[PDB]
Amino acid sequence: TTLGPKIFKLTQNVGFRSKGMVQNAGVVTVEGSVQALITAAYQQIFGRQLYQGQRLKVAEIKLENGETTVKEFVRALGRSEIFRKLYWEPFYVCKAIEYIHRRLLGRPTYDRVENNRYFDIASKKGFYGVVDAMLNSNEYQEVF
Amino acid sequence: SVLTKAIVNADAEARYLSPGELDRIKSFVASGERRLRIAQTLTEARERIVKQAGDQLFQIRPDVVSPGGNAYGEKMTALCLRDLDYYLRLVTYGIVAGDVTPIEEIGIIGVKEMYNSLQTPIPAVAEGVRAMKNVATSLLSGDDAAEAGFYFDYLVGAMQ
Amino acid sequence: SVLTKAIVNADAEARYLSPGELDRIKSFVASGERRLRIAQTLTEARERIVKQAGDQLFQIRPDVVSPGGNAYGEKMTALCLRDLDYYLRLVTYGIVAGDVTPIEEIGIIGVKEMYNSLQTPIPAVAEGVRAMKNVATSLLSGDDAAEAGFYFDYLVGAMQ
Amino acid sequence: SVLTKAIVNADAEARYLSPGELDRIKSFVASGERRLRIAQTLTEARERIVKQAGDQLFQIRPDVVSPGGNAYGEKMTALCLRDLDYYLRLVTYGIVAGDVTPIEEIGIIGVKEMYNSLQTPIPAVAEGVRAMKNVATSLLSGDDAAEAGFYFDYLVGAMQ
Amino acid sequence: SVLTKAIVNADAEARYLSPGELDRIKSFVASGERRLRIAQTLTEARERIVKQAGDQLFQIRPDVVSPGGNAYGEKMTALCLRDLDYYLRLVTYGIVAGDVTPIEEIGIIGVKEMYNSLQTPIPAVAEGVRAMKNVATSLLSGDDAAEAGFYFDYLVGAMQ
Amino acid sequence: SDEKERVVRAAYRQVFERDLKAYGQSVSEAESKVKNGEISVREFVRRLGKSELYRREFYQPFINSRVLELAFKHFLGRAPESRAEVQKYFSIISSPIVRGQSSMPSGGLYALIDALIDSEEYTSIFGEDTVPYLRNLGVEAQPSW
Amino acid sequence: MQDAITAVINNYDVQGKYLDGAALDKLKAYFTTGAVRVRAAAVISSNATTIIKEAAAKALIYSDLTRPGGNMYTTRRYAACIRDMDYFLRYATYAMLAGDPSILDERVLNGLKETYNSLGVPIAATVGGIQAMKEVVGGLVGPDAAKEASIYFDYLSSGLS
Amino acid sequence: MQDAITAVINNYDVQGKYLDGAALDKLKAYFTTGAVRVRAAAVISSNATTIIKEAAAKALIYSDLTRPGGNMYTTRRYAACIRDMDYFLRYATYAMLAGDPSILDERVLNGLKETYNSLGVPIAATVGGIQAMKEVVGGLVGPDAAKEASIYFDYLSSGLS
Amino acid sequence: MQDAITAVINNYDVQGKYLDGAALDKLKAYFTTGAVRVRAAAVISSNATTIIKEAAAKALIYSDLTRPGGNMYTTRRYAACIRDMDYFLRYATYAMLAGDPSILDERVLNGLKETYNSLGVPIAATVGGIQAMKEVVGGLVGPDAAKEASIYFDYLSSGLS
Amino acid sequence: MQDAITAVINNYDVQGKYLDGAALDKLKAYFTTGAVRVRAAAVISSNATTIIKEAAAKALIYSDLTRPGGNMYTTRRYAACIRDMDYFLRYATYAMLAGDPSILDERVLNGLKETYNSLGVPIAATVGGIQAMKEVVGGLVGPDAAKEASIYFDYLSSGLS
Amino acid sequence: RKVIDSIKIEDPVKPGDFANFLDMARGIESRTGVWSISYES
Numbered sequence A: 001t002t003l004g005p006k007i008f009k010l011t012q013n014v015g016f017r018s019k020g021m022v023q024n025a026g027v028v029t030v031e032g033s034v035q036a037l038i039t040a041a042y043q044q045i046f047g048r049q050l051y052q053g054q055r056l057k058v059a060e061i062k063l064e065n066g067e068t069t070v071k072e073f074v075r076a077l078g079r080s081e082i083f084r085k086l087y088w089e090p091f092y093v094c095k096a097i098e099y100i101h102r103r104l105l106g107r108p109t110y111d112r113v114e115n116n117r118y119f120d121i122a123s124k125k126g127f128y129g130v131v132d133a134m135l136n137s138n139e140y141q142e143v144f
Numbered sequence B, C, D, E: 001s002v003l004t005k006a007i008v009n010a011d012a013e014a015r016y017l018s019p020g021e022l023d024r025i026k027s028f029v030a031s032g033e034r035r036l037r038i039a040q041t042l043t044e045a046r047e048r049i050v051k052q053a054g055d056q057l058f059q060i061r062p063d064v065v066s067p068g069g070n071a072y073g074e075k076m077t078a079l080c081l082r083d084l085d086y087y088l089r090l091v092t093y094g095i096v097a098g099d100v101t102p103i104e105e106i107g108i109i110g111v112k113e114m115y116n117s118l119q120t121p122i123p124a125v126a127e128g129v130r131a132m133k134n135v136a137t138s139l140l141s142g143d144d145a146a147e148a149g150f151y152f153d154y155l156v157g158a159m160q
Numbered sequence F: 001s002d003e004k005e006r007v008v009r010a011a012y013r014q015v016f017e018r019d020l021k022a023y024g025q026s027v028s029e030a031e032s033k034v035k036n037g038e039i040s041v042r043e044f045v046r047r048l049g050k051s052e053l054y055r056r057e058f059y060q061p062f063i064n065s066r067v068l069e070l071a072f073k074h075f076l077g078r079a080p081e082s083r084a085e086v087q088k089y090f091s092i093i094s095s096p097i098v099r100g101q102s103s104m105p106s107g108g109l110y111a112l113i114d115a116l117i118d119s120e121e122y123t124s125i126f127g128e129d130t131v132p133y134l135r136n137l138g139v140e141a142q143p144s145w
Numbered sequence G, H, I, J: 001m002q003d004a005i006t007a008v009i010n011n012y013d014v015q016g017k018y019l020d021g022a023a024l025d026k027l028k029a030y031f032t033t034g035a036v037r038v039r040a041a042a043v044i045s046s047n048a049t050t051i052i053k054e055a056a057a058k059a060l061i062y063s064d065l066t067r068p069g070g071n072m073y074t075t076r077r078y079a080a081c082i083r084d085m086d087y088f089l090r091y092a093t094y095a096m097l098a099g100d101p102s103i104l105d106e107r108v109l110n111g112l113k114e115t116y117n118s119l120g121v122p123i124a125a126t127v128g129g130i131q132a133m134k135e136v137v138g139g140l141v142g143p144d145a146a147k148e149a150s151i152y153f154d155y156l157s158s159g160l161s
Numbered sequence K: 001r002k003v004i005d006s007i008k009i010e011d012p013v014k015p016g017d018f019a020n021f022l023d024m025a026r027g028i029e030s031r032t033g034v035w036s037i038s039y040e041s
């Protein structure tokens, strides 16, 4: 509805579709709807855009070329370098987890059962381990 | 265009065009002949405008055309005016389309990376465009000069 | 440092440190005494390095100290050498730690955005740094000059 | 001086000086050593005042040192600062005289015509004198800087 | 201020301001421009005031500036005048606030303990302040000189 | 004559949580009378409570509800123990009374301090001559709630 | 706490600066509005009780709040609530005289949000009680003082939400 | 969020009222200024970067703020600060288009005062950065739009202080 | 986080000072103990599990703590407790390598006291578990490293109490 | 708190052991150094003020710390800082007499790191103030007592870092 | 360790560690600009 925030879904082919248009056509309208999806990924995962060195290209290049989905572009961003750094590293371990959950699955944790699942996965596997559960849950897939 | 933009939003939400979207197509198409006249006048004076804008760019930025300047020399200056000719052309396209789709894919997306490589000072390209606005705008009626001016200020905006 | 970098990678994996992140630390400790000495040597000649860097820079790029240049004028030049003094300082920090670490947070992350705002030509800042390499390197033994040179070329690299 | 201005009134009415006229000569002469100190300080820093005035001027209005500018070039610039050196000198004269008689006959009566002929912006030029006041006002302790400042503001006043 | 003092007493007794408290705020604020002028004059002559207090001090106590004196030497004297500059500043603050709250937290509460540690003779600091009163007071009208004088005598009082 | 000063600096530490002597402040006028016997340690502590120095330090930077909690730790040496106890004290600091003599009557701060000091409990444990001390773990039976 | 004037003094003290032109201009901007602040305080103080009664009448009572199950049910809690109201009014009058909101933070807002969460005190309802007193105040004090009184009521209410 | 028009619709909806003459007059007062709001937004957007640079130059840099010990020392923090500046400019442009400040509360001010207290970010210095951008904006947009743009910069700055 | 070396760099950076003699002496005092820190970490890491086992045996189990009603009753909670123990050991090993306790604050102590109060986790019993691991560690690492390892266990334990 | 004589008793009491040969040897190792501890305390106490003065002079004042913007700027804060210094000196003298650091934890270090973080008090600068007082102390007390006094100053300073 | 009358001392706030006017005196240098022009010529 209009009572909540917009949801961006990349339906626009992308895929580097091609056509029956001039071979080196200058304008290709929808090759710019992907681009707004790309910036909107950043705006959920980190909350703002990154600075120049920081952006992760070569993840975008592939999304834009149609080789990987939206789902996997989020995974690359989630398991990235600055994401770790900004949000994992400087905080107490469970503060890191609670905050990371809001960014990757849009809501706060409900429980201690849930919180603990990750707290005891982070102690064996690290940042990487924790990220990969939020990303691999059943709930991620049903919802997103 | 206005058409492309309206439709893409329609198709992406799986729906027919809105009353609003239909209205803007109607207002847009009514301005067709006028927009075509604005492009003609500017196409007809393209030399005058590009040269003049170069004299004024090189007055506010005398060093671009100086020892350590990107446009220093006769053929580094020739390419610079050619780029000014490119952008005036794209501005005529934008005016007849009623939005930037074409202007954008052809000459702003990727422009930072292109000019950074060539080491061209971007903000002085933005000045060259303001200079063209000033010249072009002096060859158009008040109403048409404003309508043209929006597209000049867009390019100035995108190089930023 | 080398320590910080090794540890952060260790903790991320949540396992005590490993063989090859210990050997590097040992190398760094021996290196650190030499590294500390190089930084002290660089610190001693700072005013000479900056000033001679500044002459080498303005010959190679006179356009920045010209009418439409970012560093045109006596102050605008004073602030420019002060920035060159800043980066030499960060280079001494980088050498001593054995890892670049702190310099990045202090003076490259955000540097594009800072200088774009001020309209400073980034690639001529990179030249000012090469100029400092040349001077600093002439006050160090061959082996120490190379070790220092890596950190100068890093900054030159990051402004890119 | 105060003497020249005042005695003239005496002679023109065919009479000796009034108690009033005598009093002002006395108060004036008592304020002598201070005025001489104000002139000394400024004479002592003349080269600094002129150049820093010259930088302050060209930032606030550079175009004069550009292709179509009156002060464009090394020897067209050697003359603009020389004129700034002239006016600082006249300001020291005025301060020790306690009025403008000397300043006026030497460098304002006939000027405006003079500057106009040469086509120099007169307001460009008053910035430059106003800029010289700043550099100079800063090589003097707070009491002497004010006393000097009156004479700078006079020249700024006359040139317009 | 007068405001802070009035309010703190109000809040501590859980009540709105008294007619008295309201009256003093009104009389105080009416003297605003005058109090601001008193601070300006003294701010404008700060360097002079510090030097004349310092001369008056060393005549009266040549010993402080003697072999076994706290202020013996060129840089033990430099810090001493700097402390005199500190207290004049606080006196300007007090005058514009209309009470001592600021003067007190910044430079009297703890001052015995500070100076006892440094082994500075407190009563000769009180003399340095009297010396500043004498100089500052000679640059103010009778009425303003008294109003200023209360704050000088307070500091003299608190170092006791 | 030194026993007195052992005692008078104990009060500064009990009421203000540390001696004010090092910085250099003191409640001077009041202080002399305790040494010379006109007013008891009870009157001395009450004068320190309504003084300009304690208001600035423990009343100004906090809220009325936080002022009640710190007053119990200074004039009774223990934490508030019940919610019923908050409403007695919170509504004592909260109302104006009026001004009666020189003034500062039922104050906000002033009323709260008399109320503590004149309480039954206060003048029992420390009644009259002793400066208040923390009744923490070794000393009394501590509540666990 | 701090007021307009001590806000400036402490901002310069930490830099060890004598007051300069910019500082002196700020202090003037306070002194020049001072007489009006005083008059406004005398209106609020002397109408205190009527402001609370009209503010409660527009924003609190004749409602579920005053009925069984409501937080201002019982004479005890009704008394506590209008007691609070008097605090707000009184302190806002201090803030407006001082020309600085710092006292509203130090002696009113600090911990109050959680105190209200812990007792169950309805926050949104309390804000309406604040913004109703502002409405009444702005009528009583007139053109001279309306905007200046108003801001410290608005400071209070965005401090809770 | 809400704009001029939805502010009126929701104010009437809670009373279940069809729009009446008073409502219709308010909406007209918005529509009649609408074209001018659009032109002003196009000036701000296209001069965004220059406004920040001139505002920083007058109110932030060449100072202790940018020196060691200062909050906008380090390229990291300098970048964060002018990033913030861009937010303010951009959102004020939204508020002015909408003719309603509600978006400045919902998406900018809420919690920001305490966020800045927690990081150490100097509030007074940030306000000057806001009021300098306003100064620049008011020159660029002209008589038509100056007062209308200005108010949402003033909304922002009294929201922090 | 920071280590010995970055502690010094950041302390000078805020003053914008090149490293001077006093700084250089501090860094030497770290480098000169560096090889010993590494050897000590390799002993702790490779005896990790045995240190926890011997520390639990001396300070936790065979007690009311492991019996019904005790906080380390249930395999779930016993597992959580020795999991915690491994954190402490591992991070103390980081702190000792870095020669700086800052990581123990940033990633271990912050909020932990209240977290334990909220779950009911016995603080005093946890401290004994820390000081027992220290005892074991100090035997295993030898004269060279005993005092240096020990301090970060002591940092941990006065961080909870 | 505990001291060497007391610690030996409580360390054995928890094991329910009579004092045995190992215990008796420890207590002897304390008693045999006792007279020297007393003499050292009398030197420190009677030179207290001079030690602080010389320690501040070498490690704190004549610096940015005492200048505007510095934490020991203002007579208030200068007084608080040398007040603190006296605590450290005095308690270290207690620890050294007791031959046990436990009092330095119970009554000085507990919460102090965070207290200093919360006020902004510079930790590294405070450590230098501790290690400068140690330097002075070690000269005044002589060969007999130098090492024994020194350790409790070192206990204090690694307790903050 | 000598005379009182070093009392000529400027009283401003001294520059911070990267002001634009620490490298000001080196900023006048070795180009062809307004600071290149020989004054006595």
Ligand SMILES: CCC1=C(C)/C(=C/C2=NC(=C\c3[nH]c(/C=C4\NC(=O)[C@H](C)[C@H]4CC)c(C)c3CCC(=O)O)/C(CCC(=O)O)=C2C)NC1=O
Binding pocket: F063, F064, F065, F066, F086, F087, F090, F091, G060, G065, G070, G071, G072, G077, G078, G080, G081, G082, G084, G085, G087, G088, G107, G108, G115, G119, G121, G122, G123, G125, G126, G129
């Ligand atoms: C000096 C600054 C200061 C303030 C502002 C303050 C507020 C405050 N309000 C309280 C309770 C309360 N506050 C209210 C307020 C309200 N009830 C409602 O339904 C309305 C929404 C609202 C009035 C508009 C009520 C009903 C209670 C009683 C809660 C209880 O029964 O425990 C309490 C608990 C102690 C007590 O009951 O007195 C405090 C401390 N305390 C202070 O020291």
Ligand SMILES: CCC1=C(C)/C(=C/C2=NC(=C\c3[nH]c(/C=C4\NC(=O)[C@H](C)[C@H]4CC)c(C)c3CCC(=O)O)/C(CCC(=O)O)=C2C)NC1=O
Binding pocket: G061, G062, G063, G066, G067, G072, G073, G074, G075, G078
């Ligand atoms: C169980 C404890 C308890 C009591 C008693 C209580 C009384 C109470 N009486 C009220 C009003 C009122 N009460 C009265 C009563 C009277 N008028 C008179 O002249 C007579 C003297 C008197 C009748 C005998 C009136 C006239 C009002 C309306 C006043 C107004 O609206 O301004 C209101 C405000 C309206 C509301 O929101 O309910 C409350 C809360 N509330 C409580 O929680």
Ligand SMILES: CCC1=C(C)/C(=C/C2=NC(=C\c3[nH]c(/C=C4\NC(=O)[C@H](C)[C@H]4CC)c(C)c3CCC(=O)O)/C(CCC(=O)O)=C2C)NC1=O
Binding pocket: C064, C069, C070, C071, C072, C076, C077, C079, C080, C081, C083, C084, C086, C087, C106, C107, C118, C120, C121, C122, C124, C125, C128, H061, H062, H063, H066, H072, H073, H074, H075, H078, K018, K019, K020
């Ligand atoms: C330690 C990390 C760090 C750096 C590097 C830094 C640089 C920095 N350079 C500045 C200006 C400047 N920097 C330069 C530098 C140059 N001009 C040129 O053309 C050359 C390419 C270059 C000299 C090699 C100039 C000319 C200015 C003045 C620009 C202006 O005022 O608009 C300013 C604004 C002035 C100020 O407030 O200090 C900053 C903050 N700040 C930092 O915190």
Ligand SMILES: CCC1=C(C)/C(=C/C2=NC(=C\c3[nH]c(/C=C4\NC(=O)[C@H](C)[C@H]4CC)c(C)c3CCC(=O)O)/C(CCC(=O)O)=C2C)NC1=O
Binding pocket: I061, I062, I063, I066, I072, I073, I074, I075, I078
């Ligand atoms: C109700 C849930 C629950 C269980 C089951 C539990 C088991 C448990 N078994 C323990 C030890 C032990 N358990 C065993 C058991 C065995 N040895 C073998 O080889 C066999 C495979 C097995 C017997 C069938 C042994 C030998 C120890 C002593 C190990 C040691 O001290 O190192 C201990 C540590 C000693 C103590 O403090 O009590 C616990 C807590 N604790 C619990 O809270």
Ligand SMILES: CCC1=C(C)/C(=C/C2=NC(=C\c3[nH]c(/C=C4\NC(=O)[C@H](C)[C@H]4CC)c(C)c3CCC(=O)O)/C(CCC(=O)O)=C2C)NC1=O
Binding pocket: A092, A093, A094, A115, A116, A119, A120, I060, I065, I070, I071, I072, I077, I078, I080, I081, I082, I084, I085, I087, I088, I107, I108, I115, I119, I121, I122, I123, I125, I126, I129
């Ligand atoms: C990376 C830094 C880090 C630390 C240190 C940490 C501690 C920590 N300990 C926890 C629980 C716990 N901690 C203990 C610890 C003990 N039980 C005892 O009786 C002993 C006294 C003690 C072991 C010596 C126990 C039993 C629980 C479970 C409480 C429950 O049942 O909910 C929890 C709650 C989530 C969970 O259950 O995993 C956290 C976050 N978390 C972190 O992120």
Ligand SMILES: CCC1=C(C)/C(=C/C2=NC(=C\c3[nH]c(/C=C4\NC(=O)[C@H](C)[C@H]4CC)c(C)c3CCC(=O)O)/C(CCC(=O)O)=C2C)NC1=O
Binding pocket: E064, E069, E070, E071, E072, E076, E077, E079, E080, E081, E083, E084, E086, E087, E106, E107, E118, E120, E121, E122, E124, E125, E128, J061, J062, J063, J066, J067, J072, J073, J074, J075, J078
């Ligand atoms: C704004 C509040 C404030 C004040 C006043 C203040 C004073 C102050 N005076 C100092 C020294 C000093 N102050 C003096 C002053 C004097 N010598 C004499 O004999 C005279 C009686 C007197 C001059 C009138 C001297 C001689 C020293 C050097 C003492 C030393 O180095 O041992 C120092 C230590 C040096 C430093 O680090 O700055 C401070 C902090 N600090 C503050 O924060």
Ligand SMILES: CCC1=C(C)/C(=C/C2=NC(=C\c3[nH]c(/C=C4\NC(=O)[C@H](C)[C@H]4CC)c(C)c3CCC(=O)O)/C(CCC(=O)O)=C2C)NC1=O
Binding pocket: J060, J065, J070, J071, J072, J077, J078, J080, J081, J082, J084, J085, J087, J088, J107, J108, J115, J119, J121, J122, J123, J125, J126, J129
């Ligand atoms: C009995 C054991 C004990 C200790 C040790 C203790 C320390 C302590 N130091 C404090 C403040 C302080 N501590 C300092 C210390 C310093 N300033 C500097 O710049 C230096 C680095 C350093 C001196 C070497 C300062 C300046 C303050 C005042 C902070 C403020 O203005 O609020 C405070 C806050 C309350 C107060 O201001 O008195 C405490 C409790 N309290 C105790 O109960």
